[PDB]
Subunit: 115 residues, 4 copies
Amino acid sequence: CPLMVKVLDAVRGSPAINVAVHVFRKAADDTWEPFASGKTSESGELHGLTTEEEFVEGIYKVEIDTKSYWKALGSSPFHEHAEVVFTANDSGPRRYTIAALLSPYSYSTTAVVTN
Amino acid sequence: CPLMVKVLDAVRGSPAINVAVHVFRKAADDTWEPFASGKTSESGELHGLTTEEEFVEGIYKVEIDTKSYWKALGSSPFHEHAEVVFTANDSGPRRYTIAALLSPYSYSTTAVVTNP
Amino acid sequence: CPLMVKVLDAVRGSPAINVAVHVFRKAADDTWEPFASGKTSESGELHGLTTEEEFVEGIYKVEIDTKSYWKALGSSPFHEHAEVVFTANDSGPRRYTIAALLSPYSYSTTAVVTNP
Amino acid sequence: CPLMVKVLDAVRGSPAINVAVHVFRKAADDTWEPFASGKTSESGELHGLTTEEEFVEGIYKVEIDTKSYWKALGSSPFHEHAEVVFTANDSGPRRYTIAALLSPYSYSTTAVVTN
Ligand SMILES: O=C(O)c1cc(-c2ccc(F)cc2F)ccc1O
Ligand SMILES: O=C(O)c1cc(-c2ccc(F)cc2F)ccc1O
């Protein structure tokens, strides 16, 4: 599992469950090509998005559908979604975890890149 | 000033100076049209992007060019940029501050929205 | 003004107003002596805690009373307070801004340090 | 394991390894009584701090020795340490994870409270 996403809720202090996540890869013409997608589990995590073979070097975008998440829990959110854009490189320690911590008017994201 | 951007550096404990910022607005045809751009000052602030008259209702994307920032300082950052996407002015004019706190592998963004 | 505190609310997208703040300085005997206190204004800022003359070298603790803040608004927060502990002025006088972004189960703090 | 601590490094995008963590419980006279301590593992995590039997309701402080961490990696840090102070309550979902994301001049902390 080369790419995992983890989402936390800063208002409730809990995993953010059932949040839709879409991953895109940048095409040569600069458009965003659908790559992988899913919904976070009960633990706020989304595993199995891709495989080593398919996850080649390139620029990727992870879109987290935060707006629907907040609305469903009776909060008025600011963002349309959270976006995380980065380059996957074969040099580094290439298990990538993209983590996001969500509030109605703020979010923080970090990358934990290991092996 | 209805739309301001402020950027801080969490490594240095200082404003993030000379950071490029590009703003886009989603057009009727659903693509991202250029709306405004600028660079942060020595205080890490960017004012004068737009006017109340031009800043109509819409979905806006504020792209903060963090990679170029970290690279010009000699770091090797993770993200290409920090992107903040939001609906604005859908209940009448508001004033928006978009604030970002940067580290090489992480960033946080918050919005302060005032004045109905 | 050598020491300022700014507090933002990530739930509302606004300044965090009327937040109590207590500052302490570690004394020779190694306990925390009261140093200054105040409350944030409608802009979420607290100025005038101390003067350059009084703000000597030392280890300082800035306690931001987040629990009382969330409770007065009717929330049930996790933390008792947010605490920021740092050495100040050990290379001569500096100006410190301590900034905090609050959610009920999380907070972030950053320092902007200027002016040698 | 009722209380776990996780520490991440925002500069390197990695777990913060070998970071000392001290937990204290507030005594009736308002002093901080040592409770548990350890060093984070290779995954940035510290497990086994306490047991269900010992972790009674009360106010606790988690001190993360961030200053030594940064110095050892050649960074000039701002904080003496990071402190997280909270009340443990028997009502809620009582597995507590205290997570901290560290930068030289900033840190963010969140609580993920589950069952
Ligand atoms: O901005 C972020 O993504 C962030 C992430 C965490 C964090 C906490 C616990 C964990 F298992 C992973 C995380 F990334 C903790 C604080 C934080 O700000
Ligand atoms: O995620 C963010 O947008 C963020 C913002 C700040 C902050 C600091 C100072 C300030 F004037 C405004 C800010 F939003 C401080 C920490 C932080 O994580």
